[PDB]
C-alpha cells in the first residue's frame, strides 16, 4: 500500500521503506534498517509507505533535524499521521519553550536522584530473578527476565499493581509495534481509562509514588491539570515499559552468540560501562520523527509544511560516517557515537534509569551464568516499529557451569 507520490517529491528521492515491515528482517532489525545507508540511497528519501513520509538516513541530518525544533516540530511525532495526530503525550508532543516546565517535573520523577534511591531494589530484583533462573538451564529471556526486571521496578516506582502488567504491556505494545488489532487512538484511550481514576485519587490522597508527584506538581508557577498529569503519566508508562525490555533482548541475544565478548566483561569488569555504551549504539531500537511547520529547504530538498519526516535514532550510530565498522561490536572504540536516547530538547530523561538496569543485568547475569547460548533450533524473530523488539529469546545453559552467589 503505496500512497501516490505528492507533487513536490522528486522521483529520484523515492525509496519505499516500511518502518513497520522492512525487508531483510530475517537478518536482524538493525541490519534491515541499514539498507537505508547503502550507497545507492540518497541521505533523505521519501517512502510511499505508511501514507508517505521523509526519512533522514545520516547521523548528521538526524541530529540537525533534532536540534531544529522551529522547522521540525514534535506535535505529530509518530508515523502514520493518524497516530502522530492522536499523539498527545507530554513533554513529547510539545516544543520548547513550553516543553521545559513539563520536562522539569518529569525529571523530578525519573532523574538521577531517583535512580540513586532505587539502585538497591534494582540490584535486589536482578539477582533474585537470575538466581531463580540459574538452576533451570533454560529460559525464555524475553518473558523470564527482560519483561519482569524493568517492568516491576517501574510498577514499584509508579505505585501500580503488578497485577496490571499484562494489560498495560499490551496497550504499550500497540502504540510502538501496532498489530492491527487496535488503532493508536483506541490504545491511547484505553490507557487513559486506566490512568484517570488513579490520577483522581492521587490528587486527593497523594503518596510518594511517581504518579502522585506528577498529579500534584507545579508547572510555570501554577498547578498541573488532571489532563496534563494524564498526559505525562501515559508517557512515563510507555517510556518505562517498552524500550528497556526490548534493549535487553537484543543485547542478551548478542551475548548468547559471542563468547569472546562475555569473557571480556568477566575479566575486565571496568569495561562494562563502555560495553553498555557500545551495545546502546549497536542495538539501538527507537525510530520516531517530526512534522514540518513550514516550507523548508533542508540539504537541498524542499520539505512542505505538514510533511512528516522520520529521523531514526537507531540510525546515527549505525552510520559509517560516524562509526567505523558499525555492525561490529567493539568494547574499546575510542568514540561510541550514538543518538540512542535521542538528541536535542527531547533527550531521554529515563536515560539514567535505563543504563543502571543494563549495567546491573550484565554484571549480575555474567556472574552466575557466564556461559549460555541460544537454544538449538530456535529461530529468533525481530519486530520493527517505533520501538523495535525481539519476540522470544530461548536460552540454554548447563547449570553445572553456573555459580550461585
Ligand atoms: C534503552 C532504553 C530507552 C531508549 C532507547 C529511549 C529512547 C528515547 C528517545 C529516542 C527519546 C526521544 C524521543 C523524541 O525525541 O521524540 C526518549 C524520550 C523520553 N524517554 Fe526514553 N528511552 C528509553 C528508556 C526510557 C525510560 C526507562 C524512561 C523512564 C520511564 C523513558 C522516558 C522518557 C521520557 C520522559 C522522554 C521524553 C522527554 C522529553 O520529551 O523531554 N525512556 N526516549
Ligand atoms: C520514542 C519513545 C521511545 C519516547 C519514550 C516512549 C516513546 C514511544 C515516545 O512516545 C517518546
Swiss-Prot record:
> Which CDD domains does the entry link to?
P450cam-like
Where the protein is mainly located, per its record? cytoplasm
Give the GO biological process terms.
Answer: (+)-camphor catabolic process
Entry EC no(s): 1.14.15.1
PROSITE patterns named in the record: CYTOCHROME_P450
Q: Which cofactor does it need?
A: heme
- Keyword Cytoplasm among UniProt keywords: yes
Q: What class of enzyme is it?
A: oxidoreductase
**Catalysed reaction(s)?**
2 reduced [2Fe-2S]-[putidaredoxin] + (1R,4R)-camphor + O2 + 2 H(+) = (1R,4R,5R)-5-hydroxycamphor + 2 oxidized [2Fe-2S]-[putidaredoxin] + H2O
Question: Which UniProt keywords are listed?
Answer: Cytoplasm, Heme, Iron, Metal-binding, Monooxygenase, Oxidoreductase
**Cystine residue pairs:** none
GO CC annotations on file = cytoplasm
Question: Residues that bind heme, according to the entry?
Answer: 348
**What domain of life does the UniProt record list for this protein's source?**
Bacteria
Protein location: Cytoplasm
User: A GO molecular-function term, please?
Assistant: iron ion binding
Q: Fetch the SUPFAM superfamilies from UniProt.
A: Cytochrome P450 (SSF48264)
Kindly tell me the pathway this chain contributes to.
Terpene metabolism; (R)-camphor degradation
Q: What does this protein do?
A: Involved in a camphor oxidation system.
Protein family = Belongs to the cytochrome P450 family.
Q: What is this protein called?
A: Camphor 5-monooxygenase
Origin species: Pseudomonas putida (Arthrobacter siderocapsulatus)
Name of the gene: camC
Amino acid at each position: 500500500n503505496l500512497a501516490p507520490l505528492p507533487p513536490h517529491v522528486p522521483e529520484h528521492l523515492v525509496f519505499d521503506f516500511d518502518m513497520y515491515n522492512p525487508s531483510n528482517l530475517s537478518a536482524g532489525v538493525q541490519e534491515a534498517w541499514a539498507v537505508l545507508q547503502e550507497s545507492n540511497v540518497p541521505d533523505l528519501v521519501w517512502t510511499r509507505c505508511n501514507g508517505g513520509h521523509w526519512i533522514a538516513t545520516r547521523g548528521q541530518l538526524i541530529r540537525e533535524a533534532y536540534e531544529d525544533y522551529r522547522h521540525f516540530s514534535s506535535e505529530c511525532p509518530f508515523i502514520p499521521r493518524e497516530a502522530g495526530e492522536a499523539y498527545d503525550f507530554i513533554p513529547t508532543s510539545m516544543d520548547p519553550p513550553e516543553q521545559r516546565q513539563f520536562r522539569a517535573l518529569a525529571n523530578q520523577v525519573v532523574g538521577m536522584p531517583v535512580v540513586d534511591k532505587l539502585e538497591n531494589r534494582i540490584q535486589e530484583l536482578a539477582c533474585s530473578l537470575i538466581e531463580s533462573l540459574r538452576p533451570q538451564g533454560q529460559c525464555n529471556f524475553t518473558e523470564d527476565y527482560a519483561e519482569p526486571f524493568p517492568i516491576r521496578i517501574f510498577m514499584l516506582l509508579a505505585g501500580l499493581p503488578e497485577e496490571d502488567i499484562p494489560h498495560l504491556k499490551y496497550l504499550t505494545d500497540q502504540m510502538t509495534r501496532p498489530d492491527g488489532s487496535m488503532t493508536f487512538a483506541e490504545a491511547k484511550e484505553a490507557l487513559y481509562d486506566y490512568l484517570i481514576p488513579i490520577i483522581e485519587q492521587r490528587r486527593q490522597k497523594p503518596g510518594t509514588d511517581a504518579i502522585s508527584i506528577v498529579a500534584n506538581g507545579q508547572v510555570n508557577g501554577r498547578p498541573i491539570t488532571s489532563d496534563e498529569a494524564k498526559r505525562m503519566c501515559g508517557l512515563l508508562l510507555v517510556g518505562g515499559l517498552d524500550a528497556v525490555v526490548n534493549f535487553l533482548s537484543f543485547s542478551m541475544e548478542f551475548l548468547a552468540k559471542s563468547p569472546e565478548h562475555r569473557q571480556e566483561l568477566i575479566e575486565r569488569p571496568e569495561r562494562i560501562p563502555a560495553a553498555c555504551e557500545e551495545l546502546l549504539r549497536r542495538f539501538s531500537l527507537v525510530a520516531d520523527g517530526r512534522i514540518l511547520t513550514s516550507d523548508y529547504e533542508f540539504h537541498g530538498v524542499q520539505l512542505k509544511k505538514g510533511d512528516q519526516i522520520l529521523l531514526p535514532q537507531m540510525l546515527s550510530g549505525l552510520d559509517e560516517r560516524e562509526n567505523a565498522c558499525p555492525m561490529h561490536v567493539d568494547f574499546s572504540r575510542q568514540k561510541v557515537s550514538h543518538t540512542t536516547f535521542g538528541h536535542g530538547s527531547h533527550l531521554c530523561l529515563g536515560q539514567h534509569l535505563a543504563r543502571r538496569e543494563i549495567i546491573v543485568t550484565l554484571k549480575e547475569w555474567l556472574t552466575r551464568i557466564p556461559d549460555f547460548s541460544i537454544a538449538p533450533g530456535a529461530q529468533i524473530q525481530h519486530k520493527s516499529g517505533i520501538v523495535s523488539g525481539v519476540q522470544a529469546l530461548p536460552l540454554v545453559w548447563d547449570p553445572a557451569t553456573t555459580k550461585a552467589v
